[PDB]
Amino acid sequence: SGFRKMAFPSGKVEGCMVQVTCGTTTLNGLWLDDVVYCPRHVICTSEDMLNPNYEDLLIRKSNHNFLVQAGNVQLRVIGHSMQNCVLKLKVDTANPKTPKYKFVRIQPGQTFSVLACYNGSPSGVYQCAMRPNFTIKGSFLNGSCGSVGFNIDYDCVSFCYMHHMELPTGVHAGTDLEGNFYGPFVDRQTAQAAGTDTTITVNVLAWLYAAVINGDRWFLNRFTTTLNDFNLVAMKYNYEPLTQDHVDILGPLSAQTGIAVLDMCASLKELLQNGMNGRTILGSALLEDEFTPFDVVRQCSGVTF
Amino acid sequence: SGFRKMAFPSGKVEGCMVQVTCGTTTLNGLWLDDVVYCPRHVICTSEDMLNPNYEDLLIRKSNHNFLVQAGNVQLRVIGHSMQNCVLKLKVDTANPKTPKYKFVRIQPGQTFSVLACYNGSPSGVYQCAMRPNFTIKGSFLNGSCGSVGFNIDYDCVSFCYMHHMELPTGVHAGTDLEGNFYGPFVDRQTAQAAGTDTTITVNVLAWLYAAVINGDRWFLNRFTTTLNDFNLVAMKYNYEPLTQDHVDILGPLSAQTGIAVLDMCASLKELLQNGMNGRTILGSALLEDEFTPFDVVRQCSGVTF
Ligand SMILES: O=C(CN1Cc2ccc(Cl)cc2[C@H](C(=O)Nc2cncc3ccccc23)C1)Nc1cccc(N2CCOCC2)c1
Ligand SMILES: O=C(CN1Cc2ccc(Cl)cc2[C@H](C(=O)Nc2cncc3ccccc23)C1)Nc1cccc(N2CCOCC2)c1
Ligand SMILES: [Cl-]
Ligand code: NA
């Protein structure tokens, strides 16, 4: 019993964290096999950041201008290339701690663990979600650039995010491990803003199924809804539209608890209307949207209470 | 910016997790130097759980009855002894991954990271607090026994908790690494219940300082209070009494934000009497009490390990 915002164990990623330095800038890198991946903005000065020409800045660099430190060991850079907004530094030593891994690009609503790092040294681990507006609500200070997001389903590490910047509202933007930004963001100090964010409807539904599995049914009702009537109500509370894909994804949890997806949708509609009336669901007074259907099945018991 | 429930990086503890099997029971063990530590109830059958005489059950056992697996490697048990509710299995191989460590007993209100494990394999990491009633609101399924709690101080792992049981309300009970229970619990199948819990006042105050640091100030007011008047109000809402030690501990955060501790206490008093009025603090509609003053300072300064 219980339900916590749970992160994957971070050890396999801690053994990959390194510090990358170019002139006066220092940030984090990810060392996998003989390559160190880091944000390309490590080659920038604070002045360069308004309209940097990364191709022009990089062409002026040699291998020996990049200092890479792994623990108290200096690694030797023997090659460098840019792939989208990521710099790939070839090094003369393969990481003996390289886990089994993949690079995966995730979609909004997906969750992952973040290993926040400073100067190549891990400081903390937390769980988060790719918001519908492609930002992440992280906890990052200056020097955290290059910290990564990942999942570890079945001993293989799937890297999905590399941290690049903090937007004016305090939220964060980054790229996949191939350097493609999530969202309409660019790695420069031009005026950019997070779009209006919405609630991840399929995740709130998954979390309501987690509450039922853990024994809580107070929020259920005798009603059902059509998918279109549900979406008309949900859009009025800034909730993402629920698609037939989301309904199919919730199938296993519907079968486990005996509550049809559109029946749980009717419960969500009522909760949006009435609020919680001094009650909580899984220790929360708000409707939680950073647990996916897959996270609920991974964490919860296979036997409903 | 940002504030998340953050755990310590778990790698140094992952390298210590092993599987302990005796009879039909399989649980987790902690391998440090040449000893594997695990709950002494691993020697019990379901029948033995009502009134176990653990010395009498342990006498029947020989070293070869305990099967210890470290990954896909069998460890050889060469001795066994009991210390309070913890079984210590001497093995013929020192853990080459043993970190610098200490066994520490924590007090209620203190937080720690839990590395939840099944079959000696780490599955997740989360942050939690030792409740004033000596339970932890964890997330544990059957097979999680032997999972440990810890903090990291510089490079030293301080182990503070080993998981033993789940109470009828879904909360959890365990021991320090010397086998002493936190709370009035016993390792046997008998009628046991968590006592009435209270809110950790000093931690709510620390979290209100974290909210101010992150830009949220709607709850601040021009008023102050005495420690005496604050405790009279706090006891009315089942909040733990605030002592001069807690006030001294909040000194750094008071100086950083310019809000005296008794000024923040006046804010907390108004929140208890009026509620939040549709507003949230750090994304929460409840007053969060699982961040200590040290956790707030650490997260708002990027300390690494
Ligand atoms: O001033 C900068 C400089 N950055 C420009 C810039 C532009 C484009 C790209 Cl791709 C990267 C970056 C870097 C950047 O965002 N770095 C950071 C990453 N994650 C968290 C951070 C938390 C604080 C600071 C930096 C962070 C560097 N940024 C900044 C963004 C948002 C708020 C603030 N603060 C309000 C004023 O007090 C001080 C913190 C300062
Ligand atoms: O079945 C057992 C047996 N335990 C006896 C026992 C006695 C003393 C000691 Cl020191 C340890 C233990 C074990 C124990 O607590 N293990 C567990 C630890 N963490 C999470 C768990 C999650 C599920 C199950 C076990 C868990 C094993 N307990 C149990 C725990 C919680 C609810 C219930 N309920 C039954 C009645 O229906 C409604 C659920 C039954
Ligand atoms: Cl995805
Ligand atoms: Na005040």
List of residues 6+ apart from A192 with CB closer than 8 A = A167, A184, A185, A186
| Rounded CA separation A258/A252 (Å) | 10
Cβ distance B266 to A272 under 8 Å?
no
| Rounded CA separation A158/A145 (Å) | 19
Domains in chain A, CATH or no CATH each: 1-14+100-197 (2.40.10.10), 15-99 (2.40.10.10), 198-301 (1.10.1840.10)
Cβ distance A63 to A72 under 8 Å?
no
- Crossing angle for the helix pair B227-236 and B261-274, to the nearest 10 degrees: 30
The secondary structure element, H or E, covering residue A209 is helix A201-213
Calculate how close chain A gets to B246, using CA atoms only, in Å: 25
- Crossing angle for the helix pair A261-274 and A227-236, to the nearest 10 degrees: 30
For chain A, give the number of residues: 305
Q: Can you spell out the DSSP letters for A24-61?
A: TEEEEEEEETTEEEEEGGGG--TTTTSS--HHHHHHT-
Q: Report helix, strand or coil for B92.
A: coil
Q: Which of A113, A105, A157 is nearest to A290 (CA)?
A: A113
| Rounded CA separation B65/B22 (Å) | 6
Cβ distance B173 to B164 under 8 Å?
yes
Cβ distance B38 to B25 under 8 Å?
no
Q: Which of A162, A103, A106, A104 is nearest to A138 (CA)?
A: A162
Q: Report helix, strand or coil for B63.
A: helix
Confirm or reject: Cβ of B40 under 6 Å from ligand 2: no
The CA R_g of chain A, rounded to the nearest whole Å, is 22
| Rounded CA separation A115/A123 (Å) | 7
Q: How far apart are the first and last CA of chain A?
A: 9
Residue numbers of B between 130 and 169 with CB closer than 8 Å to A: 137-141, 166
CA-nearest residue to A123 within chain B is: B304
The answer to whether the Cα torsion of B31, B32, B35, B37 is positive or negative is negative
Q: Report helix, strand or coil for B148.
A: strand
Residues having CB closer than 6 A to ligand 1 are A 41, 49, 140-142, 144-145, 164-166, 187-189; B 1
Nearest 5°: CA angle at A248, between A247 and A250? 65
| Rounded CA separation A296/A129 (Å) | 14
| C-alpha separations of A236 from A230, A233, A239, A240, A294 in Å | 10, 5, 7, 10, 27
| Rounded CA separation A129/A106 (Å) | 10
| Rounded CA separation A57/A62 (Å) | 11
Longest dimension (CA), chain B: 69
